[PDB]
Amino acid sequence: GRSGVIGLAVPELGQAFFAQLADEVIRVAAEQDLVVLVEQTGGLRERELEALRNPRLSLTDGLLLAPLGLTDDVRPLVVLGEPLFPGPVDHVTMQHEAAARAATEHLLGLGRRRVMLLGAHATERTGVAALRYAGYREALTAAGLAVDDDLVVPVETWDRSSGAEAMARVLDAGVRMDAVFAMNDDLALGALRSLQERGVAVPGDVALMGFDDVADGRYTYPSLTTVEPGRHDIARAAVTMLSERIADAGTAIEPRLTAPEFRLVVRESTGG
Amino acid sequence: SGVIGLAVPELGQAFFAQLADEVIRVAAEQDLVVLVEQTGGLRERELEALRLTDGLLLAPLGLTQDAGRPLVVLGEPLFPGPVDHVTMQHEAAARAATEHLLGLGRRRVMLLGAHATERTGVAALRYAGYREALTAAGLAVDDDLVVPVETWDRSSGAEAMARVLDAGVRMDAVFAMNDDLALGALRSLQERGVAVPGDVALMGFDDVADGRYTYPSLTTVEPGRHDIARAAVTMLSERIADAGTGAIEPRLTAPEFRLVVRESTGG
Ligand SMILES: [Mg+2]
Ligand code: NA
């Protein structure tokens, strides 16, 4: 029976993106007097699967799942990510390709011509990274440039320490860049440290930006250019769609996909 | 699975998101799920959370000295009845933090985040430790070095630090009441070409992840997040099983703290 509880299963709250998304979900849910059970999956496929079927989450009327480990699939469900589940499930994602194209256009518009993509593999990519890469590549082609594999730098985990490590390593290997588009703010700020510790001027020598707008970038030094991917809209769409699914669980709603509008937020790290 | 509630100011605050992550992890170990609510740190919202869950873990910011359901409070001991409190070592940690700055040879130590004349709660305890450290070093408190802020956030730290710097106040160190304040202060110092730690040594309190990757990296205090979370969840589990006998007398837990030395105070 209806409890008025929805679940939110995310990798971990220690990740700013998920903590901020959770804050927005809780706030929106409270407007229709739902409460939120927050589960952590560690981004592990086995834990994501458990969230869908284990009686541990029986108090919930439905689930919002942000999967990372899943890609053989299995409680009303809305997924926060790219299309994944078949059947009567909705997916709410971000405009990865369009935002990556606009970010890259911004850097090229500053007169930078050797733009590094920090957080994607140069030859074999999958999912989100593949969409970001497609936007980046579109922008470079439009500016008469070919991709340079030395400028496409994979990173195992999109975190601060990994971005610092990778940035330091490519700088020390002698790779020449004039701008860096990092796949999230955490990567960007790790990169920022490695740049500053090597005396590289930001943005004088290397313009830098992130993605997500979750690092309180107004207060970094330099302040960090980023992309707001529509967290408020993501939360509202997710909660609204899930409520609809909870009301139609006994039955008929066609699967939907949506991706809210992004906004570039220009700060000091790219010339603001 | 049993069900507990966790009420914090907001998950957008790094310290609370990190603490929430630990609480949820400990609860999962103990076959508990967690309903998370936000209060904005406002008294009325905190009290309303008290008025689904088998027990509640409340982290208030807005309550000061001036239900039939189990309750554990992360904060100063203010509730009567069979309520357990887990309280960080504010005074001792502030004394140790101030001693750390004084040990570098600094003699004009600013306290960023407390009122100069009327303080309550946490700020009063922090001030006491700061004041004792200065007294032991033969120093007196200068009210111009005790700087109040809007709220303990990055914007407020940046705004207050910018105001005192542009005013010409002379300091050689800053002890900020939390890492968010310290990170905001760092920007205001850097944008003015003030060397950290060379001109001004800086530290915070909370050990948020972001402080490892600033340049300089931020010296801080880790107030005991693992013990806070474990103590809280474990005590709540005890009260839930008791179903209000109040046979367990109220407890006061005080987790151990640790100074984390980074580049902003010299390593
Ligand atoms: Mg119960
Ligand atoms: Na003094």
User: Right CATH number for A95-229+262-272 from 3.40.630.30, 3.40.50.1700, 3.40.50.2300, 3.40.50.300?
Assistant: 3.40.50.2300
Cis peptide preceding A88, ω within 30 of 0: no
Contact assignment for A38 to B24 by CB distance below 8 Å: yes
Kindly list the distances between the CA atom of residue A181 and the CA atoms of A196, B138, B180, B236, in Å, as whole numbers in the listed order: 16, 52, 26, 46
Give SS3 for B29.
Answer: helix
Q: Which of B191, B186, B206 is nearest to B264 (CA)?
A: B186
Which residue type occupies A199? Answer: G
Closest CA to A207 of A119, A270, A272, A264: A270
Please name the residue ranges forming H helices in chain A. Answer: 16-30, 45-53, 96-109, 127-142, 160-172, 185-197, 231-247
CA separation for the pair B247, A11 (Å, rounded): 39
Q: How was this structure determined?
A: X-ray
Pairing of strands A35-40, A5-10: parallel
Write out the two tokens for B142.
Answer: 């200068």
Q: Report the top-level CATH class of A1-93+230-261.
A: alpha beta
All CATH 3.40.50.2300 domain ranges of chain A, comma separated, are: 1-93+230-261, 95-229+262-272
Instruction: Find chain A residues with C-beta within 8 A of B17's C-beta.
Output: 13-14, 16, 19
- Cα–Cα distance, B21 to B27 (Å, whole number): 10
Residue in chain A nearest B4 by alpha carbon: A37
Residue of B nearest to A12 (CA): B21
For CATH 3.40.50.2300, list the domain ranges present in chain B. 1-87+224-256, 89-223+257-267
Q: By the 8 A CB rule, do B201 and B174 touch?
A: yes
* Number of neighbours of residue B104 by Cβ within 10 angstroms: 14
Binary contact (B210, A189; C-beta < 8 A)? yes
Chain centroid to CA B125: 11
- From its phi and psi, is residue A57 left (phi > 0), alpha (psi between -120 and 50) or beta? alpha
Can you list the alpha helix ranges (DSSP code H) found in A15-146? 16-30, 45-53, 96-109, 127-142
Can you name the residues that pair with B36 across neighbouring β-strands? B6
CA distance B218 to B213: 8
- Phi, psi at residue A148, to the nearest 5°? -120, 115
A interface test, pick of B3, B11, B30, B206 with most A CB neighbours within 10 Å: B11
CATH ID of B89-223+257-267, from 3.40.605.10, 3.20.20.540, 3.40.50.2300, 3.10.129.10: 3.40.50.2300
Most B CBs within 10 Å, among A20, A31, A38, to test the B interface: A38
Alpha carbon distances (Å) from B136 to A182, B102, B104, B112: 48, 10, 15, 20
Residue with tokens 């032991």: B136
Resolution attained, angstroms:
1.5
Reading the block at residue B147, the tokens are 């700087």
Q: Which of residues 125-164 of B touch A (CB under 8 A)?
A: 154-155, 157-158
Residue B240 alpha carbon to ligand 2 centre in Å = 49
Residue A154 is encoded by which pair of tokens? 């994979």
Residues 11-40 of A with CB under 8 A from B: 12-14, 16, 19-20, 22-23, 26-27, 30, 35-40
Cβ contacts from A onto B, under 8 A: 105
CA distance B267 to A69: 38
Structurally, at CATH architecture level, domain B1-87+224-256 sits in 3-Layer(aba) Sandwich (3.40)
Instruction: Report the distance separating Cα B194 and Cα B184, nearest Å.
Output: 14
Residue ranges near ligand 2 (ion) with Cβ within 5 Å: B 139, 142
Q: Do B213 and A189 touch (CB under 8 A)?
A: yes
Assess contact for A25 and A238: CB atoms under 8 A: yes
